[PDB]
Amino acid sequence: SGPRPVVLSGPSGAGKSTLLKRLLQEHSGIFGFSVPHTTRNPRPGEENGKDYYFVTREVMQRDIAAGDFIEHAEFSGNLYGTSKVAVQAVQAMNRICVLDVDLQGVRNIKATDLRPIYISVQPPSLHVLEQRLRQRNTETEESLVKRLAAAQADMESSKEPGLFDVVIINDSLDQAYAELKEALSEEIKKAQR
Amino acid sequence: SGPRPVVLSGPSGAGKSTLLKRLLQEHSGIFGFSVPHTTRNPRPGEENGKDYYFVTREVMQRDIAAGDFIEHAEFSGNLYGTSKVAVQAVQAMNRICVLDVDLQGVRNIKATDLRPIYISVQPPSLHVLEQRLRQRNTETEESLVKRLAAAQADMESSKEPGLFDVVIINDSLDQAYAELKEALSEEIKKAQRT
């Protein structure tokens, strides 16, 4: 039917953002992103199929009960979230659907018939994860400590046997990108033919 | 969501296509057309959400069972059809989704929960439809009589209680166009306001 999607998870500053941009480049037209659904009225400039899939609440709740949605939320009386067929619409275009979701988002993907490659990138340790986070300055010594605690949960959760097919230790960006590229080998070769 | 959809049907050559094209020319950004679905692998140049809603065969059969697709067909081992959700996706974009379908196509929209405006474009009579068609000089005799034979089925099929909210008889193309705009005045004024 097409190339398998990819599920990315891990700490925020552990390098998944830098690895994905390094993956989008050097692989042009290989990767794509799903389009979320919503029951909200379209905003000026938005268009169907590119920004949102605009449906009614009755259809979205019916498809939610059918298990089509990975992420789901309700902000101001309208529903939002990402559907599994939106990921399959990207896979139909011979493009690898990227999915960056929390540990809960990884569980919902396992529920649906989607068969992606679960990949979790992790720091070699929290000491160097603290080190890299302390090199720059975006937190205020309080939001930082919460981030180390938030990362600690996802490091132990990534040890769940059979939850992530490939775990990648970010010893170095060159070694991590090489392991990321080899993990998604046949899926790019399928998308590059 | 917003503007109510429209269903335009009738016999061929009675002015349904000429009226529809004239309406789209006068009112830009107000009307639109649905995007159908398929299980076929995309062709080069095609885009998801513009030419086709590319999904799998599993969901198409499931959504068809849910009474979603107005029409559906199969050829070369793949399914094709137009869904009510695609029609509602056009309505959300403040556009009046035009459903140019046949008699059976009109009945299939009657099942879905869409609330369209069923309009039928008809000639003054089968005799007047003959004179207007024979002047075109674009048909052979066997194809001409087959067109009138199929028209009589759709012309009489237009005579059902509640099948069409409005029926326009194309006596003059100007008066038939004014009747089409009058039957869609509130839906057009709703789209223009929003």
Can you characterise this structure?
2 copies of one chain form a homodimer. The first copy, chain A, has 193 residues and is an alpha/beta fold. In chain A, helix 5 (126-135) packs antiparallel against helix 6. Chain A has helices spanning 16-24, 57-65, 84-92, 103-111, 126-135, 143-157, 173-183, 186-192; strands at residues 6-9, 31-33, 37-38, 53-54, 69-74, 79-83, 96-100, 117-122, 166-169. In chain A, strand 5 and strand 6 (79-83) form a beta hairpin. Chain A has a single domain, classed as Rossmann fold. In chain A, the strands form 2 sheets. Chain A has a 5-stranded parallel beta sheet with strand order 2-7-1-8-9, with helices on both faces. A 4-stranded mixed beta sheet of chain A has the order 4-3-6-5. The two termini of chain A are 14 Å apart. At the A-B interface, strand 4, helix 2 and helix 3 of A face strand 4, helix 2 and helix 3 of B. Chain B: The modification N-acetylserine is found at residue 1.
Fill in the keyword field for this structure:
5-stranded parallel β-sheet, 9 strands, 8 helices, homodimer, 193 residues, alpha/beta
Query: Biggest sheet of chain A: strands, sense, closure?
Result: 5 strands, parallel
| CATH homologous group name of chain A | P-loop containing nucleotide triphosphate hydrolases
Shape field of chain A: globular
Main interface by residue count = A-B, 25 and 24 residues
Structural class of chain A: alpha/beta
> How many separate structural domains of chain A?
1
Helix content estimate of chain A = 40-55%
Instruction: State the end-to-end CA separation of chain A.
Output: 14 Å
State the CATH topology of chain A: Rossmann fold
Looking at the overall shape, the CATH architecture of chain A is 3-Layer(aba) Sandwich
Rg over C-alpha atoms of chain A, rounded to the nearest angstrom:
18 Å
What oligomerization state is this entry in?
A: homodimer
Which series of helices and strands of chain A comes N to C?
A: EHEEEHEEHEHEHHEHH
Number of helices, counting only DSSP H or I runs of 4 residues or more of chain A = 8
Portion in strands of chain A: 15-25%
DSSP, total strands of chain A: 9
User: Strand order, biggest sheet of chain A?
Assistant: 2-7-1-8-9
Give the CATH level 1 class of chain A: Alpha Beta
